[PDB]
Amino acid sequence: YTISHTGGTLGSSKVTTAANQTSPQRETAIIGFECPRKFAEIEYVGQRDSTRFIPRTTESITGTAGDDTVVSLTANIQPVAGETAIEDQDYPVAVAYNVTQGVQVDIDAVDYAADEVTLADNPADGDTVKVWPIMGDGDVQFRLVNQFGQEEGRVYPWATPLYRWHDFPQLKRGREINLHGSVTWEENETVEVLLDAPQAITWEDSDYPEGQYVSTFEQDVEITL
Amino acid sequence: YTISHTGGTLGSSKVTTAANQTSPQRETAIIGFECPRKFAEIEYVGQRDSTRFIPRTTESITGTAGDDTVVSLTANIQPVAGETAIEDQDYPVAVAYNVTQGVQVDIDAVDYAADEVTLADNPADGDTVKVWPIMGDGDVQFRLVNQFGQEEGRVYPWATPLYRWHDFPQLKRGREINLHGSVTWEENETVEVLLDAPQAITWEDSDYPEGQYVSTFEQDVEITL
Amino acid sequence: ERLGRLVDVLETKEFGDTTVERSVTQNIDRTRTDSPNNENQPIYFSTGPEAIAVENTEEWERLDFGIVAETVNIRTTDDIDIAFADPNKNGPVIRVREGESPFTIGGDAGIESAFIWLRQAETASNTPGIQIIAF
Amino acid sequence: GNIGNLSAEKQISVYDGQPFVDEQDVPADDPNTPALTIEGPDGYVIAVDAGTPIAPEFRDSNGNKLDPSTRVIVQKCDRQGNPLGDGIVFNDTLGRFDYEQMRTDPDFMRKTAKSLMIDEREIVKVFVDIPAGANGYDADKSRLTLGDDTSDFGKAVEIVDHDELSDAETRAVKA
Amino acid sequence: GNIGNLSAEKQISVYDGQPFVDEQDVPADDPNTPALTIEGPDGYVIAVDAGTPIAPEFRDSNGNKLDPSTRVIVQKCDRQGNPLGDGIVFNDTLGRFDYEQMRTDPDFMRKTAKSLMIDEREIVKVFVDIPAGANGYDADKSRLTLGDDTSDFGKAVEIVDHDELSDAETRAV
C-alpha cells in the first residue's frame, strides 16, 4: 500500500532539524529529515516528485544621511522566473525591516548590474535596519545518513547550482524543479540537504514580517501507509 | 548538406550594399545582397524561411515653446506587436534627438490614428531636433540581378504591406514573418530588395542614439556550405 | 574461385600511367628521345616568368591545374596564407612568410592535389608570388 | 538505505561559469577573437540534438543591451582554436532575442538547426560580429544559457562517458 | 542563377490594399451594404476550405474597436452585385475577437464552417450588421486579413489560374 505526502520544513513530526553554514565556503549540512516510528518506509524519486526550495539570507545596516542606496550585498541578485519588478514576482528578491521603528519596509528601485538596491525611507543616523535578500550563488545536494551517524551515499550527485531554483517559476508545472536519483529511508534514519555558498542562511528571525520562516524546503514524496 | 544562416545588414561580407530611394515615389532599390566566392549557392524559400524588416525614416524640426508634441509624422505607426505601451514593446517605435543639446528624448505617449507623439522635453528656439520613426505603409519586392548588372527577374512579385514586419511577435515560434516564392543565387550575382513608399528611408545617421544602425533587414536563409 | 584473383589482377590496378585505350604506337612514342610527339612530353603547371599581382586579403582565390599533383614549390616575396581544399569545407590552412621561402612540399609521399587556394596573409605589404608543380 | 542506480546519458544545461568554459571580454569590432570558448571536458563526450534552444544574456559594461544589429555565431572548431566555416549551427542577431523568459517559454526559446556531437579535446567558440560604436562585452555582467534538465521542455543536453564502438564511429568526425 | 517556378495554388493571405476588393465606409444600420465588395480578380479563381481564420480589424475614425454586439457575415454572391442566400461561411460577432491577439494566438482565432470558391466575375460580400449606437465604420484606419500564409497555425488561400478539367468541374457548381 502506498500514498503521496510532502516532506517539509516541519514535516510529520519535530524530529526534523535545520542549521546554518560557514562564512568560508564548504559543504555544510543544512537540513535533516529523519524518519519516525509512525511510518514504515519512505521514498523520493527524482524526475517524478518535485521539490521547492526558497533560500534567503540576512544582512543589516546602520543609517546615516544619504543612505537611500544599499551596496552590493555580497551576492548576485538574480531575477525571479526571469522577472524584475517585485510586485510581479512569485516572491520577493528582497525584504527589509527598520528595527528601530519596528516596521516592515518596501523597495523603490533595484540594480542587478551592480547588485545594489535603493529604498523608500532614508533611515535615521544611528537607525538600525535588517535585510533579507535571496541567497546568491552556491551549490546544493542530498546525502543519506544511517542510524550510526554515518554517511551512506549521495543521490544523482550533480550538485545543482543555486540560481536555477530562483530562475524558474517553481510552482508552474513543467517549470517545477525535478531533481534526479532515488532514495529509500528506513525507520530511525536520516537524509540531509547540504550547501556551499558565500553567505549565511537564516530561519526564524523574529523580526521578519511575512511569516515565521523566511526560507523553506519542501518536497513531494511517496510513503507506505 | 545545407545549413541555416542569416543574411543581414552586414552579414557574411561587405560586398553587400545599402542605399536609399527617392522622394518621387518610384520603385527603386534599397539593399544589395551580392554573394561571395566563399560560398557556392544560396537558397531562399518563402513560406519556409523567415524574414524581418525594421524600416525607419528621418524628419527634422525646429524647437520652440510648446513643442512637446511631434506633429504628423508622415508614417503609419502601429502598435508594436499589438501593444501600445513603449515599455512593453519587443522593441521601440520612434526616437528623437535634440542635436544642439546632444541629448536623447525618451517618450511619454503616442497617437496611433493621427500618427503623432508627445515627449518629456521641450527643446529650445533656433534648436534642431531630428526624429526617426518606424516607416509605416509601403510596397517592396525582391529582384535578382546577375553579375552583369542586369536583371533576370523577381521572386513572387506580390507586394507585401511594409507594416506587416511589425505586426507579430517577430521572434516567437509560429509567428515569424515570411513571404512567398523561392530563389537561388549564384556566386557573384546579386539579389536586390526594392521599395516604394511615401518617404525616404535612412541609415547610419550619426546622431541616432540607439545603435550605429537605425534600421535593418534580416532574412533567415539556407546555404550550400 | 580463381575469378576473384582474375578481377584482382594488377594490370587493372595501380598501373602508373592510367590506361585508356593506349595504342601501342602511342606507348612506344611516349618513350622516344628524338623529337617531341604529343606523348613525348610531360605535363605540369606554373605561372612565370612574372609573379602575380594579387590584391585580395579575405576571400580565397583559386588556382587549378589539369592534373593531380604530387609536389609543389613556391617562391614568394613576403607573406601569404595557403591551403588545399578550403573554405566552405572545414579544411586547414598554412601560413608562409619570407625567410621560409622557397617553400616546397611533396616527397613521393602521396599527395593527391588539384586545387590550391590563396589569400594575402596580413602582416605584409602587397606582396604575392609564384607557384610551381611537378607530378 | 538504497540510493539507486543511474544511467550514462546525463541530461544538463550549459552556461558560462562551468569549468570547461572560458569567458573573455571583447572590443568593438574584432570578430575573430572568441568571446566564449567551450572545450571538451577531457574524457566525456557532449551531444546537442537539433531543435535546441539558446538563451544568451549579452549586455554591456553599463548594464544595457548591445546593438540589435549584432550577429551572434556559434561555430565548431578544431582541437586548436581555428574556425571551420562548415559545422556552424547558428548565425542570427539579438534584436530577435528577449532575455526575461528566454529559458522559460518554449515559444520564446529560439533554437538550433543542426545536431552536434563533441569529443574529448574539441572546441566550440562563440563569435560576435559588431559595428564600431558599441560598448563591447562585459562577460562578468553577461552570461549564457543553453538547455535545461529539470523541465521536460526545449531539449536537455546529453553527456556521457565512453560507450565503445559507438565511440569508434563518433571518432569519424575527423575530416 | 535560377529562381524556381511555382504552383497554380498560390498560398497567400488577403488584405485591403489588394485592388480587387473595394472597401466602403458604412453607417450604423446598413446591414445589406458590402463593406467589402470582393470582385473576382478578372483572371483568377479563389478557393478556401473550412477551418480558415479571419482577422476582422474593424475600427472607427478614432481607432476604437467597434461594438462587440455587431455581427459579421461573409457570403458568396452572383456576378451582377447580388448575394445568393446559400454560400455562407461565417456568421458571428466582433466580441469574439481579441485585437492584440486575434491574429496571433490559436485559441483567439475563429474559423470558417464550409467550402468556398470564387470565379473571375463572381462576387463575395462581407456584411456588417450594426445597431444604431455605434460610430459606423472607417476603412482608412482599418483593414482585414483572411487566412494566414505565415504560421504553422491556420491556413492560407488558394488563388489559381485556369486549369482545364479542374476549372470545368469548378464552373460545374
Cell numbers found for residue E84 = 445568393
> What one-character DSSP code corresponds to residue E60?
-
Give the separation between CA A156 and CA B182, rounded to whole angstroms.
50
Please tell me whether residue B32 adopts helix, strand or coil conformation.
Answer: strand
* Torsions phi, psi for B201 (to 5 deg): -135, 160
Cβ contact E28:E130 at 8 Å: yes
D interface with B, Cβ–Cβ < 8 A, is 67-69, 71, 85-86, 88-89, 91-93, 95-98, 106-111, 113-114, 129, 131-134
- Residue with cell string 561580407: B13
Distances (CA, A) of C121 to A101, C86, C133, D71, E67: 71, 15, 22, 25, 70
Is B58 exposed, middle or buried, given 0-12, 13-18 or 19+ CB atoms closer than 10 A?
A: middle
Give the separation between CA B170 and CA E164, rounded to whole angstroms.
41
End-to-end Cα spacing for chain B: 8
Q: Would you call E62 and B175 a contact, using CB atoms and an 8 Å cutoff? A: no
Give the separation between CA C52 and CA C131, rounded to whole angstroms.
9
Please tell me whether residue C12 adopts helix, strand or coil conformation.
Answer: helix
Longest distance between any two alpha carbons in chain C, whole Å = 67
Q: Which of C95, C90, C85, C93 is nearest to C122 (CA)?
A: C95
In whole angstroms, what separates CA C81 from the centre of its chain? 17
Is C99 exposed, middle or buried, given 0-12, 13-18 or 19+ CB atoms closer than 10 A?
A: exposed
Which long-range contacts (C-beta less than 8 Å, at least 24 apart) are formed by C16-23? none
Cβ contact E97:E108 at 8 Å: yes
Nearest CA in chain B to D71: B11
> What one-character DSSP code corresponds to residue E66?
-
Q: What is the distance in angstroms between the Cα of C23 and the nearest Cα belonging to chain D?
A: 41
Which residues fall within 8 angstroms of residue A164, CB to CB, at 6 or more apart? A177, D150
DSSP string for residues in A177-192: -----EEE--TT-EEE
In whole angstroms, what separates CA B199 from the centre of its chain? 13
Cell numbers found for residue B10 = 552586414
Q: Which residues of A190-215 are buried (b: 16+ CB within 10 A; e: fewer)?
A: bbbbbbbbbbebbbeeeebeeeebbb
Give the separation between CA C84 and CA C93, rounded to whole angstroms.
7
Q: Would you call B40 and C89 a contact, using CB atoms and an 8 Å cutoff? A: no
The continuous run of DSSP H or E covering B20 comes out as none
The continuous run of DSSP H or E covering A38 comes out as none
Cell numbers found for residue C63 = 588556382
Q: How many residues does chain E have?
A: 173
CA angle centred on E72, ends E71 and E76, rounded to 5°: 140
Q: Which of A184, A221, A169, A164 is nearest to A48 (CA)?
A: A221
Cβ contact C108:C53 at 8 Å: no
DSSP string for residues in C54-97: ---SSS-EEEEEEEEESEEEEE-SSEEEEESS-SSSS---EEEE
Which residues fall within 8 angstroms of residue B59, CB to CB, at 6 or more apart? B73, B74, B130, B131, B133
* Torsions phi, psi for A131 (to 5 deg): -140, 145
Distances (CA, A) of A177 to A168, A174, B143: 8, 8, 51
Q: How many residues does chain B have?
A: 225
Indicate the Cα dihedral angle E65, E68, E74, E80, nearest 10°.
Answer: -70
Is D27 exposed, middle or buried, given 0-12, 13-18 or 19+ CB atoms closer than 10 A?
A: exposed
Q: How many CA atoms lie within 13 A of E16 on its CB side?
A: 20
Cβ contact B8:B193 at 8 Å: no
On whether any CB of chain D is under 8 Å from the CB of C87, the answer is: yes
Nearest CA in chain B to D28: B212
With beta carbons under 8 A apart, name residues in chain C contacting B39: 88
Chains C and D touch (3+ CB pairs under 8 A): yes
Please tell me whether residue C5 adopts helix, strand or coil conformation.
Answer: helix
Q: Which of A165, A133, A138 is nearest to A28 (CA)?
A: A138
DSSP string for residues in E97-118: --TTTTTTSSTT--B--S-EEE
Q: Would you call B176 and E150 a contact, using CB atoms and an 8 Å cutoff? A: yes
Cell numbers found for residue A119 = 529604498
On whether any CB of chain C is under 8 Å from the CB of D175, the answer is: yes
Q: Which residues of B162-177 are buried (b: 16+ CB within 10 A; e: fewer)?
A: bbbbbbbbbbbebbbb
Q: Which of D85, D108, D38 is nearest to B5 (CA)?
A: D85
In whole angstroms, what separates CA D148 from the centre of its chain? 13
Q: Would you call C93 and D87 a contact, using CB atoms and an 8 Å cutoff? A: no
Please tell me whether residue B164 adopts helix, strand or coil conformation.
Answer: helix
Longest distance between any two alpha carbons in chain D, whole Å = 62
Give the separation between CA A162 and CA A199, rounded to whole angstroms.
12
With beta carbons under 8 A apart, name residues in chain A contacting D59: 113
Q: What is the distance in angstroms between the Cα of B12 and the nearest Cα belonging to chain C?
A: 11
Q: Would you call C89 and D85 a contact, using CB atoms and an 8 Å cutoff? A: yes
Residue type for C97, please?
R
In whole angstroms, what separates CA A58 from the centre of its chain? 12
Cβ-based neighbour number of residue E38 at 10 Å = 22
Q: How many CA atoms lie within 13 A of E170 on its CB side?
A: 20
Give the separation between CA D105 and CA D103, rounded to whole angstroms.
6
Q: What is the distance in angstroms between the Cα of D5 and the nearest Cα belonging to chain B?
A: 38
Q: Which of E43, C10, E1 is nearest to B188 (CA)?
A: E1
Q: Would you call B37 and C88 a contact, using CB atoms and an 8 Å cutoff? A: no
Cβ contact C103:C76 at 8 Å: yes
With beta carbons under 8 A apart, name residues in chain C contacting D76: 90
Give the separation between CA C76 and CA C131, rounded to whole angstroms.
9
Cβ contact B57:B73 at 8 Å: no
Q: How was this structure determined?
A: cryo-EM
CA angle centred on B12, ends B7 and B15, rounded to 5°: 100
Please tell me whether residue A110 adopts helix, strand or coil conformation.
Answer: strand
Cell numbers found for residue A74 = 555580497
In whole angstroms, what separates CA B212 from the centre of its chain? 14
**Domain hosting residue D68, numbered range:** 1-175
Q: Would you call C59 and B40 a contact, using CB atoms and an 8 Å cutoff? A: no
Cell numbers found for residue E142 = 482599418
Q: What is the distance in angstroms between the Cα of B90 and the nearest Cα belonging to chain D?
A: 8
CA angle centred on B194, ends E139 and B153, rounded to 5°: 115
Please tell me whether residue A149 adopts helix, strand or coil conformation.
Answer: coil
Domain count, chain E: 1
Mapping DSSP onto H, E and C, the string for chain D reads: CCCCCCCCCEEEEEECCCCCEECCCECCCCCCCCCCEEECCCCCEEEECCCCEEEEECCCCCCCCCCCCCEEEEEECCCCCCCCCCCEEEEEECCCCCCCCCCCCCCCCEECCCCEEECCCCEEEEEEECCCCCCCECCCCCEEEEECCCCCCCCCEEEECCCHHHHHHHHHHCC
Residue type for E17, please?
G
Which residues fall within 8 angstroms of residue D9, CB to CB, at 6 or more apart? D158, D159, D160
Q: Would you call B184 and E3 a contact, using CB atoms and an 8 Å cutoff? A: yes
